[PDB]
């Protein structure tokens, strides 16, 4: 039963939310291999734990840059939340620690690369292929939302493909635990819900809007609302006029009309039946939800990888050194990290 799993999951989450783990490793235990990704706020590097040979992805955040960009609270949210959750399609936080200059989060490595890469190269996914990924997001959001968490940054760039072809959601930089309403303008423009951009105050329903954007993008190969500059994208979003490509099935079109619903009183995921209106939709009729959860469904795409520590599914980035000051920077701002 789903409900009995959720209550046993909320009891584990809460215990770790109230008493977070801190300082579980040090930098000198890790060999730095390669930069896998860069960010507004920081960089992610492939790292090897020397004593075990285990490979991890390490997010490094420069504390001074975090303060400048006013992300202190979001960064504390990210680590606090990540160390407390456990779910098959969320990346596992293994270790976290900090030094004089930086914050570090050492996570599970997914060698299949970002969904983003495979999507742009291939052009678009078949409906069955899109659906396999979408169902994993549906369940992940069912779990997250039951803990009062809003995710707020769904996009192909933050979905990694693991060795079996399944998804790991990474980057919880905008995740927040909220009962009720919140107001921050944050996210990625193409994935912003109209509520967010109109400054109305919003809730977990924004994530169901973004699932709509994601399914559309996966299946079409481009997002439903695009333009060269953000302000143009916001215009189209609030107007809420969507065109579907010819090749979308009518079941797909109907699910998407319910997810990309501007009026949050008619948006799927936000009605009296909640996540069940999505899971019971005709577009998901072939989906065995428990089999996805147990990962017993064979994946339509399994990425080719020659050994652990292989990075060929990732783009190349410019390598920078990790500089560590001899004086502690922003001690009291990150004391709880």
């Amino acid at each position: 039963s789903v409900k009995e799993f959720l209550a046993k999951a909320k009891e584990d989450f809460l215990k770790k939310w109230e008493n977070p783990a801190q300082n579980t490793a040090h930098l000198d235990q890790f060999e730095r291999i390669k930069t896998l990704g860069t960010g507004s706020f920081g960089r992610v590097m492939l790292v090897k734990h020397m004593e075990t040979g285990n490979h991890y992805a390490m997010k490094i955040l420069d504390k001074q840059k975090v303060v400048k960009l006013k992300q202190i609270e979001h960064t504390l949210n990210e680590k606090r939340i990540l160390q407390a959750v456990n779910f098959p399609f969320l990346v596992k936080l293994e270790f976290s620690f900090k030094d004089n200059s930086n914050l570090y989060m050492v996570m599970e490595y997914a060698p299949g690369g970002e969904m983003f890469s495979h999507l742009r190269r291939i052009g678009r996914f078949s409906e069955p292929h899109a659906r396999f990924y979408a169902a994993q997001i549906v369940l992940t959001f069912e779990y997250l939302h039951s803990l009062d968490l809003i995710y707020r940054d769904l996009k192909p760039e933050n979905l990694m493909i693991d060795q079996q072809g399944y998804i790991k959601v990474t980057d919880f930089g905008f995740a927040k635990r909220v009962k009720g309403r919140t107001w921050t303008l944050c996210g990625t423009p193409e994935y912003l819900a109209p509520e967010i951009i109109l400054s109305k105050g919003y809730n977990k329903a924004v994530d169901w809007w973004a699932l709509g954007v994601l399914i559309y993008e996966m299946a079409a190969g481009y997002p439903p609302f695009f333009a060269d500059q953000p302000i143009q994208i916001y215009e189209k979003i609030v107007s809420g006029k969507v065109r579907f490509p010819s090749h979308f099935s009518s079941d797909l079109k109907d699910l998407l009309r319910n997810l990309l619903q501007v009026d949050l009183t008619k948006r799927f995921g936000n009605l009296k039946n909640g996540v069940n209106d999505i899971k019971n939709h005709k577009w998901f009729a072939t989906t065995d939800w428990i089999a996805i959860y147990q990962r017993k469904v064979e994946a339509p795409f399994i990425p080719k990888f020659k050994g652990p520590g292989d990075t060929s599914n990732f783009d190349d980035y410019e390598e920078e050194e990790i500089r560590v000051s001899i004086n502690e920077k922003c001690g009291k701002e990150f004391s709880e990290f």
Binding site: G39, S40, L69, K70, Q71, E114, F116, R120, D153, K155, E157, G173, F174, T184, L185, C186, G187, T188, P189, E190, G221, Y222, F226, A227, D228, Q229, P230, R243, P245
Partner: peptide, 20 residues
């Protein structure tokens, strides 16, 4: 085509999040 308009746009690479 919409595809051709997307590919000609400035938003086909990794998209960075905005902050407040």
């Amino acid at each position: 085509t919409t595809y051709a308009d997307f590919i000609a746009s400035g938003r086909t690479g990794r998209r960075n999040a905005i902050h407040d």
